[PDB]
Amino acid sequence: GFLGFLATAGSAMGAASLTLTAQSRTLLAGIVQQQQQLLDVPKRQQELLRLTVWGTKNLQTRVTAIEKYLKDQAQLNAWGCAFRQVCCTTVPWPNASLIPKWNNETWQEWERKVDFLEENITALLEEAQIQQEKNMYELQKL
């Protein structure tokens, strides 16, 4: 589609350049080409669109494109900062033993050093957003 995400790999975390439109673009390129094929197959074979294996493998790939897009949006909305880049959430970093070398390490190298933190962090980020929402709920009610 473009693969501009991978294009900056090796540039280090600082000044890596983050792009928020990148998932929309990979999905959009995908949907258009797959839709054209959905309408093209019936020109010769309309009956066996899902009966045989190719139509169930292609269904899983079309479903994955949609489910993947939505998982990112759902996780971001759970955190609430879907369009905030750095998001600036209130959950503290777990420990001082895992601090990135912002000017030496690449995001690819860094993320693999925090895989065991993400499991606890995702929940904490959601909890922080939930309490902020509870506080606003009460302000709107009263």
Partner 1 sequence: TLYVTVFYGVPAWRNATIPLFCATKNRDTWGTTQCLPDNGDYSEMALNVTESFDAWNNTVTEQAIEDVWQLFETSIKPCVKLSPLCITMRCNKSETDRWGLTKSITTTASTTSTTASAKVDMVNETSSCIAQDNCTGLEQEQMISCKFNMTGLKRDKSKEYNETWYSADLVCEQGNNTGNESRCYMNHCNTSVIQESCDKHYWDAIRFRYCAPPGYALLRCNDTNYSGFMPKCSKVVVSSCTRMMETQTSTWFGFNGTRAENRTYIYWHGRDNRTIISLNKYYNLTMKCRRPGNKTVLPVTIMSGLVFHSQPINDRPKQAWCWFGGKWKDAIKEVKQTIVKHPRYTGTNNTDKINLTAPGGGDPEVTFMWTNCRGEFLYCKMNWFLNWVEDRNTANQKPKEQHKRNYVPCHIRQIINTWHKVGKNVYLPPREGDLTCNSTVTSLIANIDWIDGNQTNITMSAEVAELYRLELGDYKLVEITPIGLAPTSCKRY
Ligand X SMILES: *[C@@H]1O[C@H](CO)[C@@H](O)[C@H](O)[C@H]1NC(C)=O
Question: For binding to a copy of itself (CB under 8 A), which residues are involved?
Answer: 17-21, 23-25, 27-28, 31-32, 35, 38, 46-47, 49-53, 55-57, 59-60, 62-64, 66-67, 69-71, 74-75, 77-78, 80, 83-86, 88, 126, 129-130, 133-134, 136-137, 140-141
Instruction: Report yes or no: 137 and 86 within 8 Å, Cβ to Cβ.
Output: no
- φ/ψ of residue 95, rounded to 5: -160, 165
Tell me how far CA of residue 55 lies from CA of 6, 45, 58, 60, in angstroms: 30, 11, 5, 9
Q: Quick one: 24 or 120, whose CB is closer to a copy of itself?
A: 24
The answer to whether residue 129 forms part of the interface with partner 1 (CB under 8 A) is: no
Among 94, 118, 136, 137, binds ligand X (CB under 6 A): 94
The site for ligand X (CB under 6 A) is made up of: 10-11, 94-95, 97-98, 101-104, 116-117
